[PDB]
Structures are given as C-alpha cells and as structure tokens.
Amino acid sequence: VLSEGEWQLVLHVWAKVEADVAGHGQDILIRLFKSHPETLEKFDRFKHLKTEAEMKASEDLKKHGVTVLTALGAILKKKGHHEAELKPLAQSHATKHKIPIKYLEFISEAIIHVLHSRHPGDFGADAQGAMNKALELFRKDIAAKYKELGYQ
Numbered sequence: 001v002l003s004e005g006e007w008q009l010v011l012h013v014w015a016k017v018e019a020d021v022a023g024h025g026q027d028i029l030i031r032l033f034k035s036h037p038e039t040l041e042k043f044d045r046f047k048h049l050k051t052e053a054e055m056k057a058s059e060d061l062k063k064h065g066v067t068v069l070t071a072l073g074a075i076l077k078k079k080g081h082h083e084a085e086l087k088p089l090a091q092s093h094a095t096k097h098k099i100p101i102k103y104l105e106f107i108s109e110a111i112i113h114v115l116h117s118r119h120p121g122d123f124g125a126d127a128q129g130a131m132n133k134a135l136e137l138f139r140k141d142i143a144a145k146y147k148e149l150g151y152q
C-alpha cells in the first residue's frame, strides 16, 4: 500500500539494523518486556528473567531476538509481496502461541522506539512514517490471516 520511496526509506533503515541484528534484537525485546510485562508470560522460557542485566545476559533470548528480526526482515524486503513468508508466521502465532494483535501493536512500538534511539539521523518523520505504515500492512495481513484460521 506504500510508495516506492517509502519502501526505500524502510529498507534504508533496515540496512542499519542488519549491521547488528543481535544488538537491535535484544533492545527490542527488552523494551517490550519492560513497557508491557504481560507479554512476558507468553515466554515460558524467558519468564524467569528478573532484571535487565539478566535479560541482557541470556544467550537464548538474544538468539530468539535474531530469529524475530530475521523473519521480519525477510517480509519487509518483499515490499508487500509477502504471503509466502507471512503465512507460516500467522499460523503458529495464531495456533501455537496465541498472540493477540494488540501484542503486535506493542512490539511494533518497541521497534520504532529502538530504531529511533539508535538511528536518529536515519529515522526522521518521513522515514519513521514509512516504517509505521510498513508495520501496519504486516499487522493487517497478519490479522486477516488469523481469522481465516479461526483465531482473530
């Protein structure tokens, strides 16, 4: 639904992220667990992490964070043509994990916040606008996909 130029802005940031997938990954997750602790319960496995440092220190978490961004990155470089990629994600989050759409709104926030913190000079209004939109297209697609699975 985005213009060619918005894609480029999106992808232009994405390239910075990609220079430190793991580091972004951790800030991203950690912010989420921090701004909305409830999301933390969906992780049977990270739920025992009581502090920031402890989160910062977890190999597992960090690993998990590369996984999330890898997948996310894969969709974004499809510039809207991402059915293939999107489908498998929706099935499990809908089926296995049960992540409500609100939860996606939360991670979406966490994303934009980390990028803005790390990449100011590359993350202005238009570029921040472009990323938002991108995150909305993904979330929209995901939601339809959820219903079709009989989730929401």
Ligand code: HEM
Residues within 6 Å of the ligand: 039, 042, 043, 045, 064, 067, 068, 069, 071, 072, 088, 089, 092, 093, 096, 097, 099, 103, 104, 107
């Ligand atoms: C950008 C949005 C998201 C993307 C790209 C994403 C991506 C992934 C990927 C690629 C996996 C690996 C295998 C799987 O599909 O089960 C995963 C697993 C998982 N995701 Fe997400 N995720 C996102 C958002 C979330 C959110 C917001 C939550 C909960 C608040 C969540 C909960 C989980 C959990 C619990 C698992 C399995 C963890 C494990 O391996 O133990 N996901 N996610």
